[PDB]
């Protein structure tokens, strides 16, 4: 007979984390509640105010499918 993290190049993780932090800040503006907000963001990241969450979910889905195809291709 590490490709999973390789496809992201660790940049995608940081970018998605910062963008999820800004989106969670916008959602929080809209203690454990923030943790549940990040839980929602990461929940969308793995594919398990309303409009922003919907668009964020769509972008997360597209990103997930793209990540899957690129990870399969790279593997």
């Amino acid at each position: 007979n590490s490709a999973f993290l390789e496809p992201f190049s660790a940049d995608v993780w940081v970018m998605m984390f910062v963008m999820l932090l800004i989106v969670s800040a916008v959602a929080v503006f809209v203690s454990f509640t923030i943790g549940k907000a990040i839980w929602l963001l990461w929940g969308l990241v793995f594919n398990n105010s309303k409009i922003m969450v919907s668009v964020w979910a769509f972008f997360a889905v597209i990103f997930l499918a793209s990540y899957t195809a690129n990870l399969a291709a790279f593997m």
């Binding site: 963008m19 800004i22 916008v26 105010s49 409009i51 922003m52």
Partner: peptide, 21 residues
């Protein structure tokens, strides 16, 4: 980021319209 900023502006305009109604 741009979509989030414009999304916040669109949400602000929509909320202001709903508040005006």
């Amino acid at each position: 980021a741009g979509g989030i900023v414009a999304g916040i502006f669109l949400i602000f305009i929509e909320i202001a319209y709903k508040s005006r109604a």
